[PDB]
């Protein structure tokens, strides 16, 4: 279920970075740790937000109707 | 409106048993080998160490709520540096030719040994402890 | 089976259960707009009031203490000492 | 039998479904009727 | 020579070994396989936590929307746990997690978290922390042999 | 279900006033002000300011229960100095101070590049 | 019958509890919604119409509102569906079933209810969210925690019923229970932890904070205490203000292992006039202990004042703890490098002994103990080596723990933690066991298929050498699993079998009560105890006191209580007494003194025939020691001038007092003896304390202070007598059955199993035994 | 074993002494054996103490025993309570168990928790055998709308 | 429905220790790190010792690490992962090795005298929430009152309360009885 | 140039590191709290749903929409619905946006906050505008649609403050510190052998002079100088949070002065 909009603990908007993130990984073959820092996610509260997310909306979409 | 005890002491020991701000001073008076002192001090606001010749005074003066400034330019029983307030609780016959005294300053303890004091030491709460140099 | 005002051996004092049932009853009556025998110092609560009437030994009630044999003793609220 | 669970008892139960692991854990379950 | 910081193990005084465990952590069941460091944990506590995992919320199926059952709790934002287990992978736990990586603090604060109560960050409850969906469903039919 | 409306933290209800001044009984020249719809922000701030006034003999505040956005502030002053005035001064000071800060910060900000 | 089982429950509610540091000991937080639901039928009155009318106007769904209005003719006006809700001119006599409001008495209880304390009465306080809230200190009487427990609120419905709650079972009136014969509630968790920290000598508080603390105490008299330090910086001691919380005229003395009116370690406890003079305030002083600040204040200042004492303390101490914080992490579970070393060998040599003892047995050099097998005495010795290894490894660990170590801190204050914990966390976990033996050979001749047969080493049969911090090994993890499990299995049993017993005890004594003839009988009128507890006393008015007379040498006994006016040396030095000089030689007075001293000796002999131990400390009503200190500073007595006390005043005063204690009043031969009996032990204490020398040489009392004390003792003694009506049948049962529901574990049957053995009068006991002398 | 004993000077002295602990019982035949103080001999089987020394002894024993069970937990409980237990368990000359002996009674009436739903056959039988109910039980008085003669209701209030 | 975390709700970590909420504070009141991080949850230190629940502490320390470095923390049971090694990694990241951190009080801004164990831990959300158990029966004109609560009330000696509770409000009736044969055979 | 003075270390569209000196810990602290919770901001606070064939529920989507940051520079002139005399809302106390998205392609259609369409008259004031700081310009991912799923919504954003709901939070996370060296002694460090070696050091240390081995404790020193850094979600310019925050706190104390007046 979708990237949280905003990190729980401080509110840094973290909803506009899912895709950016998944890209810094795939093509730029970066470690999760470096990707995050480059998305500007410096505090661990903000980090755990993206790192820990599971994009279930992807398997949710796979059902026909 | 009085002064109850005056004398200079030569501190022989300074003990810090797990207290980062308080120590136990056990000094031996000057002159009378009879007189001996035990005290708790805030080595943080007023340091102390080996064979220091500290002056000590008791009295009961300069209980209604406490006030702070203004008198800063009025009363100055500040002729000393370290100063405490506390209540006295008991006099014990240390048997013989010497009578002791236990003082409690909100926790910081004090024991005094002598004799002429029977006349110089109160029988009630009030009691300030002053120290200088 | 009755026991004369003299010969009473029971306690001179009021037990908490007794002082608890009196305040109860009395309080009840007061709640039922009953004649009050005290001068309110501006008190509104009935229980509160009953405690005062008890305080001023002004409660015409009598406690009948039953022994287990069947006999009994009658003590007037007024006598009973109220310490607790 | 499969609806009730009374062969002829407790066998057969509504599959747990609160959490994915709670379900796994239910299919991996055991029971002992009735010296240590 | 031996890292002191490591647990003390006995030895391999054996020249008769017939078999060898695939891995010792394979003595735990489903529940226990989700506990981090159950080996640095008091014996019973593991049995309590095994029971509670069943009382937990999260995605239990990626098709909950298409299902019609008496009650179902879905966690708004499930989260794979930062600390895991080489065994969680076969229990597809990171896929259908239960739980959320909350930023905890062990401290005596307002006195409002004694005898097992917790102080929870309101502002985060707002931004979505721990919200869940609740789905109940009733059902009925018509007559019988009438 | 038994949760009050969030806006009840800052919006005064019916018959409530930002301030209630009851005269203290225990000590002389003492007062207890009750601030409604205000938390520590204003509370701890004013006790601070009030404590610079050498004519303020006593000054503290408390929020008796975190469920209610309100707090009491007690203020004792020397004889002949109305505690109300003591509060008025602290408030002014708290402002002039924030006056300077707002000014100085904007200034500094205007010299920044980026 | 469906009503006798309380099935049809009216006017009650139930929800989750959650603690609240700002509720008073006797309150109970009620969620607004629940309050709007529970009602109380209040008749209209010249003194409440105003209020009652406003509630009716507020209606059924705005808290200080109401539902139904009942008129003279028993009619029921429903304020939610009624064309005349905006009208209604309430009348004297009508009833307005209001909503529940603040301060209403209500019965609150957590199940299972095995006490009285598990069903006490609180003042309501309507609050916002949806959980019943209560003061933390009320936690143990109920035996509740906040991991989701639920509790029940009951609402009295009559004016009689209400009083019965507020006057009989109110929370403050239960603070000192008659079961443990001490205070049932103390200070805990955060408040206990903080009160220790706040109390160290090292702890100082400056003006900014001192003032906020002072204000937090409601009963505070707005009088800032003078700083303990006035020098370069006026600073206050943690004790200083915590004393603000303590009411005046409260005296307490402690003296722990090394305490000495100078407590170099800040040991013991010394409070005078409600001012703490020395000692760190921890569990012993403020927990639920026998001589505690609580037990005392309750008996001295009253239950309501003691109720607020919890509150005031938890307000200052909890406020202080908020701005200092306390915490706990792994760092706290780590031992110094050298310490781990000294521990890793302490175990290593422990294994050696085990190894040797094995080689010795394998050679058949072991000589079995008496009645034991070579095999049993081997296990016995091996187990002993390992537990001994576990304990010394532990003390090693416990020792480095700095004064900073948060875990040590929680252990020092007495709020969670214990050697066994630090020992198992930081150093070795221990030997696992099951059925009082090490891991058996469930597999043939072995523990697990990872070992060879006939292997009795420690690794093999259950020893866990590692710590929780270090982690268990697979083999360790499993045995431990086997043990911890046994701990779960019987915990389940111990729970059941006890709940059984407890209910079964209540059945047998539920009908026993104390009657107006001060007797204890059952429903049949049969006598069970001619005097309750044999002394007619009420357990809650009893305290442990020491009868000085028993102990010591006959010599000290004489230097103490002996007075001989006819003898220069051993007489009353005229400094003690006014008529001391002119008494030297009074023949007629000696007769009195001699008759006194004789009585004291008869007593000393009697006490030594009752308590063969030589044991002097026993619970008895009226704490005399106190009444006296309560004379030392109430009349400001100076131990300098002589007393204006007559040797008769004392001797004849103390002698008359005894005529009044009274537990029975029968005006006949039999009862008058009972009276003498029931009072015998107490008088022994009385006579030993108010003995002529003592009252003159030990505590220079004056004819007034003494005349006061006498007067006082009589009062306290009479308040301590049991009230006819007390249902001691239940009390007793519940008093044995609740402390039995906490038991959960040198070879003998103990615990619930044993108790069940006893209560069932089982002829086939498991651990018989004869003890011959 | 240790044993505080009086000294000829008066103080109590720890005067150690030898004691035999046994794993089996035969009180009757061991008291007789010479060399032992038949006065101090003890057993934890109160049932045997009673049979050899009389119920009053048994009572003391039974208490001494109940005590240890609690004491062994560090716990403490006021004498009056266990004492009362021990007495109820004794007043009839013999040791009576409380973990439910009778299937009907222990000390109740013919109305309290009218169990069996046979308040039907119970009332018919109660009429047959002129039963006299004392009405001292809480629930019996409930059915009469009265307070039972306990605490608050153990005395009448009058005008 | 959408159930949002309420004061009485149930939560638990994975170390056999559940625990309801006892209040909620807004980020400004919560204690804060110097970086500006503030907690989501605040459990009581007093719930650790007696529990021997050390894995919890490790998991947290290990988690602070994983987050800080974008790695996945391996908390499997029988590995060689140590508290020491993890502390080494945490320290490289600039944080004090055992998890402690200087924090400030939200009301005052002043520092907290003690440092606090701060970091992420996995917490679960248990079902059966308060707004599902609030039941409050009143119908004027557990939760049952059984033999057990009845006994307690008798101990208290609350005689009249027991009458008011166990009874069924059926309005007391008035009858005239004969003193010789207790039957209601009196013509009044 | 008077009491509270500022020294800025860094600045940007999102961050501002500065040093506050000649200020009590109090003011420094309140000012901080204010920012975190008492500064007006515009946020979607009402959502009407026409069509939702998405795999997310309505309240789920709605919660995110309320979370999407929106311009708020001219809020100081937009009104609080509860104060506007209209019946519900209007261009005087709100901003209405609309979100219409339809799964067209078979490549999974993403919905972003840039698909929000303001339909009310913004009356020339800069306010209400999905904020976007993305590289590709898609300010926050709202939802995902498959083959042919719909999603028709109308959102009404209102002037709000964090206290009511964290969404009206424009401050992200504040860095606070003072007395980098424990000179003041407001903390008792927990050590295991050497405190000074176990606890790292703050970059603020660099900006203050060490303690010097044998100097006695300065019992008269109080807390001066605070090293802060205010982050910003965007809804408002960094420099603005600080200012408005100071404004708000300033107006608050003002209200107490007015209150004593009316009194
Ligand atoms: Mg519980
Ligand atoms: Zn964040
Ligand atoms: Zn008749
Ligand atoms: Zn409008």
Curated annotation (Swiss-Prot), chain A:
UniProt entry keywords in alphabetical sequence: DNA-directed RNA polymerase, Isopeptide bond, Metal-binding, Nucleus, Ribosome biogenesis, Transcription, Ubl conjugation, Zinc
Primary localization class, coarse: nucleus
Crosslink position(s): Glycyl lysine isopeptide (Lys-Gly) (interchain with G-Cter in ubiquitin): 59
Protein residues bound to Zn(2+): 7, 10, 45-46
GO BP annotations listed: nucleolar large rRNA transcription by RNA polymerase I; ribosome biogenesis; RNA-templated transcription; termination of RNA polymerase I transcription; termination of RNA polymerase III transcription; transcription by RNA polymerase I; transcription by RNA polymerase II; transcription by RNA polymerase III
Gene3D superfamilies, A to Z: Homeodomain-like (1.10.10.60)
SUPFAM superfamilies with a match to the protein in the record: RNA polymerase subunit RPB10 (SSF46924)
Localization: Nucleus, Nucleolus
Database matches in InterPro entries: RNA_pol_su_RPB10, RNA_pol_suN_Zn-BS, RPABC5/Rpb10
A GO CC term attached to the entry: RNA polymerase I complex
Domain of life of the source: Eukaryota
GO MF assignments: DNA binding; DNA-directed RNA polymerase activity; zinc ion binding
Miscellaneous note of the record: Present with 5300 molecules/cell in log phase SD medium.
Assembly and binders: Component of the RNA polymerase I (Pol I), RNA polymerase II (Pol II) and RNA polymerase III (Pol III) complexes. Component of the RNA polymerase I (Pol I) complex consisting of 14 subunits: RPA135, RPA190, RPC40, RPA14, RPB5, RPO26, RPA43, RPB8, RPA12, RPB10, RPC19, RPC10, RPA49 and RPA34. The complex is composed of a horseshoe-shaped core containing ten subunits (RPA135, RPA190, RPB5, RPO26, RPB8, RPB10, RPC10, RPA12, RPC19 and RPC40) where RPA135 and RPA190 form the DNA-binding cleft.
UniProtKB/Swiss-Prot annotation, chain E:
Organism, as annotated: Saccharomyces cerevisiae (strain ATCC 204508 / S288c) (Baker's yeast)
Any further remark recorded for this protein: The binding of ribonucleoside triphosphate to the RNA polymerase II transcribing complex probably involves a two-step mechanism. The initial binding seems to occur at the entry (E) site and involves a magnesium ion coordinated by three conserved aspartate residues of the two largest RNA Pol II subunits. Present with 18700 molecules/cell in log phase SD medium.
Subcellular location per the Swiss-Prot or TrEMBL entry: Nucleus
Similarity annotation: Belongs to the RNA polymerase beta chain family.
Assembly: Component of the RNA polymerase II (Pol II) complex consisting of 12 subunits.
Residues of the full protein shown: 722 to 867 of 1224
UniProt superkingdom: Eukaryota
Function as written in the Swiss-Prot or TrEMBL entry: DNA-dependent RNA polymerase catalyzes the transcription of DNA into RNA using the four ribonucleoside triphosphates as substrates. Second largest component of RNA polymerases II which synthesizes mRNA precursors and many functional non-coding RNAs. Proposed to contribute to the polymerase catalytic activity and forms the polymerase active center together with the largest subunit. Pol II is the central component of the basal RNA polymerase II transcription machinery.
Protein name: DNA-directed RNA polymerase II subunit RPB2
Chain positions recorded as Mg(2+) binding sites: 116
Swiss-Prot record, chain F:
Keyword DNA damage among UniProt keywords: no
Compartments where found: Nucleus
One Pfam match: RNA_pol_L_2
Source species, domain of life: Eukaryota
Effect caused by changing residue 114 to P: Transcript termination readthrough
UniProt effect for mutating residue 108 to K: Transcript termination readthrough. Lethal
One GO term describing the cellular component: RNA polymerase II, core complex
Any one GO biological process: RNA-templated transcription
Keyword Transcription: yes
Key words of the record: DNA-directed RNA polymerase, Nucleus, Transcription
InterPro entries for the chain: RBP11 (IPR037685), RBP11-like (IPR036603), RBP11-like_dimer (IPR009025), RNA_pol_Rpb11_13-16kDa_CS (IPR008193), Rpo11-like (IPR022905)
Molecular function terms, GO-annotated: DNA binding; DNA-directed RNA polymerase activity; protein dimerization activity
First-listed, main subcellular location of the protein, grouped into a coarse class: nucleus
Any further remark recorded for this protein: Present with 4280 molecules/cell in log phase SD medium.
Complex formation: Component of the RNA polymerase II (Pol II) complex consisting of 12 subunits.
PANTHER family: DNA-DIRECTED RNA POLYMERASE I,II,III (PTHR13946), DNA-DIRECTED RNA POLYMERASE II SUBUNIT RPB11 (PTHR13946:SF16)
Family: Belongs to the archaeal Rpo11/eukaryotic RPB11/RPC19 RNA polymerase subunit family.
Stated name of the protein: DNA-directed RNA polymerase II subunit RPB11
From Swiss-Prot, chain H:
Protein modification: The tandem 7 residues repeats in the C-terminal domain (CTD) can be highly phosphorylated. The phosphorylation activates Pol II. Phosphorylation occurs mainly at residues 'Ser-2' and 'Ser-5' of the heptapeptide repeat. The phosphorylated form of Pol II appears to carry, on average, one phosphate per repeat. The phosphorylation state is believed to result from the balanced action of site-specific CTD kinases and phosphatases, and a 'CTD code' that specifies the position of Pol II within the transcription cycle has been proposed.
Subcellular location: Nucleus
Cross-link (Glycyl lysine isopeptide (Lys-Gly) (interchain with G-Cter in ubiquitin)): 64
Domain of life: Eukaryota
Role, per record: DNA-dependent RNA polymerase catalyzes the transcription of DNA into RNA using the four ribonucleoside triphosphates as substrates. Largest and catalytic component of RNA polymerase II which synthesizes mRNA precursors and many functional non-coding RNAs. Forms the polymerase active center together with the second largest subunit. Pol II is the central component of the basal RNA polymerase II transcription machinery. During a transcription cycle, Pol II, general transcription factors and the Mediator complex assemble as the preinitiation complex (PIC) at the promoter.
Family designation: Belongs to the RNA polymerase beta' chain family.
Record-given protein name: DNA-directed RNA polymerase II subunit RPB1
Shown segment, full-protein numbering: 1287 to 1445 of 1733
């Amino acid at each position: 279920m979708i990237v949280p909009v905003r990190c729980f603990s401080c509110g840094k908007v973290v909803g506009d970075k899912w895709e950016s993130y998944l890209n810094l990984l795939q093509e730029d073959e970066l470690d999760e740790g470096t990707a995050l820092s480059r998305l500007g996610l410096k505090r661990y509260c903000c980090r755990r937000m993206i790192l820990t997310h599971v994009d279930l909306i992807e398997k949710f979409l796979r059902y026909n109707p | 409106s009085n002064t109850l005890f005056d004398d200079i002491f030569q501190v022989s020991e300074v003990d810090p048993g797990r207290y980062n701000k308080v120590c136990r001073i056990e000094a031996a008076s000057t002159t009378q080998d009879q007189c001996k002192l035990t005290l708790d001090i805030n080595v943080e606001l007023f340091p102390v160490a080996a064979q220091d010749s500290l002056t000590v005074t008791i009295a009961s003066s300069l209980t209604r709520s406490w006030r702070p400034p203004q008198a800063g330019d009025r009363s100055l029983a500040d002729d000393y540096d370290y100063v405490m307030y506390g209540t006295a609780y008991k006099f014990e016959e240390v048997s013989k030719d010497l009578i002791a005294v236990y003082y409690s300053f909100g926790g910081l303890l004090m024991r005094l040994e002598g004799n002429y004091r029977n006349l110089n030491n109160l029988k009630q709460e009030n009691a300030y402890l002053l120290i200088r140099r | 089976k009755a026991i004369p005002k003299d010969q009473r051996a029971t306690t001179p004092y009021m037990t908490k259960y007794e002082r608890a049932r009196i305040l109860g009853t009395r309080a009840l009556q007061i709640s039922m707009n009953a004649p009050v025998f005290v001068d309110l110092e501006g008190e509104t609560d009935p229980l509160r009031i009953a405690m005062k009437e008890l305080a001023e030994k002004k409660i015409p009630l009598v406690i009948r203490r039953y022994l287990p044999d069947g006999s009994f003793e009658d003590w007037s609220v007024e006598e009973l000492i109220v310490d607790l | 039998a499969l609806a009730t669970g009374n062969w002829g008892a407790g066998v057969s139960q509504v599959l747990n479904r609160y959490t994915y692991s709670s379900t796994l854990s239910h299919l991996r379950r055991t029971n002992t009727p009735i010296a240590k | 020579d031996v890292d002191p910081a490591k647990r003390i193990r006995v030895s391999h005084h054996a020249t008769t070994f017939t078999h060898c465990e695939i891995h010792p952590s394979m003595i735990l069941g489903v529940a226990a396989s989700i506990i981090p460091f159950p080996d640095h944990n008091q014996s019973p506590r593991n049995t309590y936590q095994s029971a509670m995992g069943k009382q937990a919320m999260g995605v239990f199926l990626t098709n909950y929307n298409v299902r019609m059952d008496t009650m179902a709790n879905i966690l708004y934002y499930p989260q794979k746990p930062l600390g895991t287990t080489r065994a969680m992978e076969y229990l597809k736990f990171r896929e259908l997690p239960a739980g959320q990586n909350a930023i905890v603090a062990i401290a005596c604060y307002s006195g409002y978290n004694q005898e097992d109560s917790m102080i929870m960050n309101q502002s985060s409850i707002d931004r979505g922390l721990f919200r869940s969906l609740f789905f109940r469903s009733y059902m009925d039919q018509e007559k019988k042999y009438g | 279900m038994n949760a009050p409306d969030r806006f009840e933290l800052f919006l005064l209800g019916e018959g409530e006033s930002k301030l209630k001044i009851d005269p203290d009984t225990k000590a002389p020249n003492a007062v207890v002000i009750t601030f409604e719809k205000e938390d520590h922000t204003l509370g701890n701030l004013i006790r601070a300011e009030l404590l610079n006034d050498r004519k303020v003999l006593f000054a503290a505040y408390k929020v008796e229960h975190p469920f209610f956005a309100r707090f009491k502030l007690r203020i004792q002053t020397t004889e002949g100095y109305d505690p109300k005035d003591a509060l008025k001064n602290a408030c002014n000071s708290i402002i002039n101070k924030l006056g300077a800060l707002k000014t100085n910060f904007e200034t500094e900000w205007n010299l920044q590049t980026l | 019958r469906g009503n006798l089982m309380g099935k049809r429950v009216d006017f009650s509610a139930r929800t989750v509890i959650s603690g609240d540091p700002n509720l008073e000991l006797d309150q109970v937080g009620v969620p607004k919604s629940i309050a709007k639901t529970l009602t109380y039928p209040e008749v209209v009155t010249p003194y409440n119409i105003d209020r009652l009318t406003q509630l009716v106007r507020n209606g059924p769904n705005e808290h200080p509102g109401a539902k139904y209005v009942i008129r003279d003719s028993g009619d029921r006006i429903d304020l939610r569906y009624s064309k005349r809700a905006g009208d209604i001119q309430l009348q004297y006599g009508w009833k307005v079933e209001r909503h529940i409001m603040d301060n209403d008495p209500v019965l609150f209880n957590r199940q299972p209810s095995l006490h009285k304390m598990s069903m006490m009465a609180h003042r309501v306080k309507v609050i916002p969210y949806s959980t019943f809230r209560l003061n933390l200190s009320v936690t143990s009487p109920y035996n509740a925690d906040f991991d989701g427990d639920e509790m029940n609120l009951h609402v009295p419905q009559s004016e009689e019923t209400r009083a019965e709650l507020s006057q009989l079972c109110a929370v403050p009136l239960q603070i000192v229970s008659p079961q443990s014969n001490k205070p049932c509630m103390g200070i805990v968790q955060d408040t206990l932890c903080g009160i220790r920290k706040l109390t160290l000598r090292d702890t100082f508080i400056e003006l900014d904070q001192v003032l906020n603390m002072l204000y937090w105490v409601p009963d505070w008299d707005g009088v800032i205490p003078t700083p303990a330090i006035i020098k370069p910086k006026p600073l206050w001691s943690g004790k200083q203000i915590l004393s603000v919380a303590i009411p005046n005229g409260i005296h307490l003395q402690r003296f722990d292992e090394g305490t000495t009116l100078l407590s170099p370690k800040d040991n013991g406890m010394l409070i005078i006039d409600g001012q703490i003079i020395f000692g760190v305030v921890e569990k012993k002083t403020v927990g639920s202990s026998n001589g505690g600040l609580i037990h005392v204040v309750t008996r001295e200042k009253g239950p309501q004042v003691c109720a607020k004492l919890f509150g005031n303390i938890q307000k200052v101490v909890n406020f202080w703890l908020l701005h200092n914080g306390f915490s706990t992490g792994i760092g706290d579970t780590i031992a110094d490098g050298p310490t781990m070393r000294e521990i890793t060998e302490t175990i290593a040599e422990a294994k050696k002994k085990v190894l040797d003892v094995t080689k010795e047995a394998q050679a058949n050099l072991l000589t079995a103990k008496h009645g034991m097998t070579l095999r049993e005495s081997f296990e016995d010795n091996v187990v002993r080596f390992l537990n001994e290894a576990r304990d010394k490894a532990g003390r090693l660990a416990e020792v480095n723990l700095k004064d900073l170590n948060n875990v040590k801190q929680m252990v020092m204050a007495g709020s969670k933690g214990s050697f066994i914990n630090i020992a198992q966390m930081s150093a070795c976990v221990g030997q696992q066991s099951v059925e009082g033996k090490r891991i058996a050979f469930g597999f043939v001749d072995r523990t697990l298929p990872h070992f060879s047969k006939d292997d009795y080493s420690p690794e093999s049969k259950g020893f866990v050498e590692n710590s929780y911090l270090r982690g268990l090994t697979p083999q360790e993890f499993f045995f431990h699993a086997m043990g911890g499990r046994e701990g779960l299995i019987d915990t389940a049993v111990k729970t059941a079998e006890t709940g059984y017993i407890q209910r079964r005890l209540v059945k047998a004594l539920e009908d026993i009560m104390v009657h107006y003839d001060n007797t204890t009988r059952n429903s049949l009128g049969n006598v069970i105890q001619f005097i309750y507890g044999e002394d007619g006393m009420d357990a809650a008015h009893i305290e442990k006191q020491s009868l000085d007379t028993i102990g010591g040498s006959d010599a000290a006994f004489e230097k103490r209580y002996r007075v001989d006016l006819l003898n220069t040396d051993h007489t009353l030095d005229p400094s003690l007494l006014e008529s001391g000089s002119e008494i030297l030689g009074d023949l007629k007075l000696q007769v009195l003194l001699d008759e006194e001293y004789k009585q004291l000796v008869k007593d000393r002999k009697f006490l030594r025939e009752v308590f063969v131990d030589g044991e002097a400390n026993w619970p008895l009503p009226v704490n005399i020691r106190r009444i006296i200190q309560n004379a030392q500073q109430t009349f400001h007595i100076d131990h300098t001038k002589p007393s204006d006390l007559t040797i008769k005043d004392i001797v004849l005063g103390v002698k008359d007092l005894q005529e009044n204690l009274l537990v029975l009043r029968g005006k006949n031969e039999i009862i008058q003896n009972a009276q003498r009996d029931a009072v015998t032990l107490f008088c022994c204490l009385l006579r030993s304390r108010l003995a002529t020398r003592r009252v003159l040489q030990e505590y220079r009392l004056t004819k007034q202070a003494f005349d006061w004390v006498l007067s006082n003792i009589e009062a306290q003694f009479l308040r301590s007598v049991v009230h006819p009506g007390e249902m001691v049948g239940v009390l007793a049962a519940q008093s044995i059955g609740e402390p039995a529901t906490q038991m959960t574990l040198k070879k003998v049957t103990s615990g619930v199993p044993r108790l069940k053995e006893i209560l069932n009068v089982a002829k086939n006991m498991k651990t018989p035994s004869l003890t011959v002398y | 074993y240790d044993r505080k004993v009086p000294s000829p000077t008066g103080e109590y002295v720890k005067e150690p002494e030898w004691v035999l602990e046994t794993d089996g019982v035969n009180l009757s035949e061991v008291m007789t054996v010479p060399g032992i103080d038949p006065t101090r001999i003890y057993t934890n089987s109160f049932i045997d103490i009673m049979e050899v020394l009389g119920i009053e002894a048994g009572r003391a024993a039974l208490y001494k025993e109940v005590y240890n069970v609690i004491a062994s937990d560090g716990s403490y409980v006021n004498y009056r309570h266990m004492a009362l237990l021990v007495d109820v368990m004794t007043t009839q000359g013999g040791l009576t168990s409380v973990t439910r002996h009778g299937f009907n009674r222990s000390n109740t009436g013919a109305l309290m928790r009218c169990s069996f739903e046979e308040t039907v056959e119970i009332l018919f039988e109660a009429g047959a055998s002129a039963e006299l109910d004392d009405c001292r039980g809480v629930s019996e008085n409930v059915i009469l709308g009265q307070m039972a003669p306990i605490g608050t209701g153990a005395f009448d209030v009058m005008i | 429905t959408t159930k949002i975390p309420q004061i009485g709700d149930k939560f638990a970590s994975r170390h056999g220790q559940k625990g309801t909420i006892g209040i909620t504070y807004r980020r400004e009141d919560m204690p804060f790190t110097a970086e500006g991080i503030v907690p989501d949850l605040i459990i009581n230190p007093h719930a650790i010792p007696s529990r021997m629940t050390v894995a919890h502490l490790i998991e947290c320390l290990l988690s602070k690490v994983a987050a800080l470095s974008g790695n996945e923390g391996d908390a499997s049971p029988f590995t060689d992962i140590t508290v020491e090694g993890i502390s080494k990694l945490l320290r490289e990241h600039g944080y004090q090795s055992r998890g402690f951190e200087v924090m400030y009080n939200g009301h005052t801004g002043k520092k907290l005298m003690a440092q606090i164990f701060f970091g992420p831990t996995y917490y679960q959300r248990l079902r059966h929430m308060v707004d599902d158990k609030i039941h409050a029966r009143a119908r004027g004109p557990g939760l049952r009152f059984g033999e057990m609560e009845r006994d307690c009330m008798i101990a208290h000696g609350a005689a009249s309360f027991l009458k008011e509770r166990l009874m069924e409000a059926s309005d007391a009736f008035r009858v005239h009885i004969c003193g010789i044969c207790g039957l209601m055979t009196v013509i009044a | 140039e008077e009491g509270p003075q500022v020294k800025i270390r860094e600045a940007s569209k999102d961050n501002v590191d500065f040093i506050l000196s000649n200020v009590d810990l109090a003011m420094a602290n309140s000012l901080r709290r204010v920012m975190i919770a008492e500064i007006p901001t515009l946020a979607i606070d009402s959502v009407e749903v026409e069509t939702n064939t998405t795999v997310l529920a309505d309240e789920f989507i709605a919660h995110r929409l309320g979370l999407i940051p929106l311009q708020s520079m001219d809020i100081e002139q937009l009104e609080y619905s509860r104060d506007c005399f209209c019946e519900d809302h209007c261009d005087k106390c709100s901003v209405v946006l609309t979100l219409q998205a339809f799964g067209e392609s078979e490549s999974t259609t993403n919905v972003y906050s840039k698909d929000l369409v303001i339909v009310s008259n913004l009356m020339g004031r800069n306010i209400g505008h999905p904020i976007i700081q993305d590289k590709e310009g898609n300010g926050v991912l709202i939802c995902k649609l498959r083959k042919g799923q719909e999603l028709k919504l109308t959102c009404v954003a209102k002037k709000g403050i964090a206290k009511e709901h964290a969404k009206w939070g424009p401050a992200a996370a504040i860095e606070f510190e003072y007395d980098p060296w424990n000179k003041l002694k407001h903390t008792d460090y927990w050590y295991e052998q050497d405190s000074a070696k176990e606890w790292p050091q703050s970059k603020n240390c660099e900006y203050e002079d060490p303690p010097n081995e044998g100097d006695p404790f300065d019992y008269k020193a109080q807390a001066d100088t605070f090293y802060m850094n205010v982050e910003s979600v965007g809804s408002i310019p960094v420099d603005q949070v600080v200012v408005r925050g100071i404004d708000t706190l300033q107006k608050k104390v003002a209200s107490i002065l007015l209150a004593l007046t009316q009194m």
